[PDB]
């Protein structure tokens, strides 16, 4: 897995997706990653899950990806931030939104826009967080907007955004 | 510390020129021992691209 | 608001003059009126009205001034600056100054 690269060591042209710190109250950790092998996992997990790492010394450490620092000039990653999981509803995570089926406005109307492609919520379960949030858009009429207030939140989840905020909304054509 | 000019002072911004002058090598191919004191160690770091630092 | 006191206590810039200042608190007639050298965080001459009696507030105030004048003269002080509180020089406090410098 990851190796220690404290301070400012040079990276391989194999990107080794460096510049990675995991932190909470306890300890800060080292950078070095394994380039594409990072990306191959990250897209699968994509902020909504955790995965362990094993630097020599510490054989395990769970973190859920707090944020990434990609290049601007060549759309590739650079630095990634992490946060450790103290368990027992401590997690403030941004769940992806998703939409199911044909909508009544997808029948005869037009556009079906997700105004918030992702949305933040606290998770009562630390190691169990939704990987998505399928939304039942079938029943809305053209010109209506599903607000966040009626967005299903499984197993006692709180909503970290405004109840009245629009999330998806059908839109007129043109 | 051993020091030797192996670059001309000509055409180089004048802080580097008074720097080599106070270092006391007035011609390329000069050398001298130098004190470890941070003042003169920084006096040599300023124009290290002109010199061969040996020690 | 009571921007009387921050104003009057910014006008004691003449604590740079070396004179001490003489705060007064025409509140419950508690008029404790401390004397302070500001440079240290130190006060030098209290005169609280704990059981002085003396009657009506305007004259008990002059009693507090005449007693504090001795209480500070013991220690060796004479330069004075009358840092009034929000209060005017209206009498019930003016008696404090009259009786205080009556017997510095």
């Amino acid at each position: 897995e990851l190796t220690a690269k404290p301070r400012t060591p040079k990276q391989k042209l194999d990107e080794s997706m460096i510049a990675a710190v995991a932190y909470n109250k306890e300890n800060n950790v080292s950078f070095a990653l394994d380039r594409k092998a990072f990306d191959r996992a990250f897209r699968q997990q994509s902020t909504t899950g955790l995965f362990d790492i094993t630097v020599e010394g510490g054989e395990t450490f769970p973190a859920l990806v707090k944020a990434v620092q990609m290049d601007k000039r060549k759309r590739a990653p650079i630095h990634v931030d992490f946060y450790m999981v103290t368990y027992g509803e401590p997690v403030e995570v941004s769940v992806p939104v998703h939409t199911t089926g044909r909508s009544q406005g997808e029948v005869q109307g037009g556009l079906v826009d997700i105004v918030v492609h992702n949305l933040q919520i606290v998770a009562p379960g630390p190691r169990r967080i939704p990987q998505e949030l399928v939304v039942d858009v079938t029943k809305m009429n053209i010109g209506d907007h599903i607000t966040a207030g009626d967005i299903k939140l499984p197993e006692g989840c709180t909503l970290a955004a405004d109840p009245e905020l629009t999330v998806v909304s059908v839109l007129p054509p043109r | 510390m051993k020091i030797k000019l192996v670059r001309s002072v000509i055409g180089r911004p004048g802080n580097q020129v008074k720097t080599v002058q106070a270092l006391g090598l007035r011609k390329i191919g000069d050398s001298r021992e130098v004190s470890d004191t941070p003042a003169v160690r920084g006096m040599v770091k300023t124009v290290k691209h002109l010199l061969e630092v040996q020690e | 608001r009571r921007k009387l006191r921050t104003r009057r206590k910014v006008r004691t810039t003449t604590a740079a003059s070396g004179r001490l200042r003489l705060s007064v608190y025409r509140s419950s007639k508690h008029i404790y009126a401390q004397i302070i050298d500001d440079s240290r965080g130190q006060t030098l001459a209290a005169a609280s009205s704990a059981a002085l009696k003396s009657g009506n507030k305007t004259d008990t105030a002059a009693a507090v001034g005449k007693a504090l004048a001795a209480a500070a003269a013991e220690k060796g002080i004479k330069q004075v600056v009358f840092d009034r509180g929000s209060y005017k020089y209206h009498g019930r406090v003016k008696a404090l100054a009259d009786a205080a410098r009556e017997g510095g």
């Binding site: 902020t47 839109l171 054509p173 | - | -």
Partner: protein, 134 residues
């Protein structure tokens, strides 16, 4: 594209973009490869062509905008007197700054939309799909 009221004139320079390196709003998008000014009219042509490909569509955000006047000197005149009066507006577009961002159209349809929308443009560009976004 034209700015409804302002102060009159400007200047210029470049270094790499610090506002809008990531896409929101849309499904896919398009990004600059080259620093440049872009005129109101280059925008409007991208709008005209991508509205040609998006009939009854409405998925066309334009996350760029001509803020900067640029003022050519009149006909044939020797130098002397001000920068004439403004001839056209332009938008600074440093690399990595997204310009365009579609939704609701299948990958090859948006890809052709971006082919034509880039070909009227004075710069290299690239289509991007969104996933490394916080």
């Amino acid at each position: 594209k034209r700015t409804k009221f302002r102060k009159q004139f400007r200047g210029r320079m470049t270094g790499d973009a610090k506002g809008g390196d990531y896409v929101a709003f849309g499904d896919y998008g398009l990004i600059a490869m080259e620093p440049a000014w872009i005129k109101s009219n280059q925008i409007e042509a991208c709008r005209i062509v991508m509205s040609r490909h998006f009939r009854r569509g409405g998925k066309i955000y334009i996350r760029i905008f001509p803020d900067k006047p640029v003022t050519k000197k009149p006909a044939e005149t020797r130098m002397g007197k001000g920068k004439g009066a403004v001839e056209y507006w332009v938008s600074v577009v440093k690399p990595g700054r997204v310009m365009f961002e579609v939704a609701g159209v299948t990958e090859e349809q948006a890809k052709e939309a971006f082919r034509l929308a880039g070909h009227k443009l004075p710069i290299q560009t690239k289509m991007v799909k969104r996933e490394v976004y916080d």
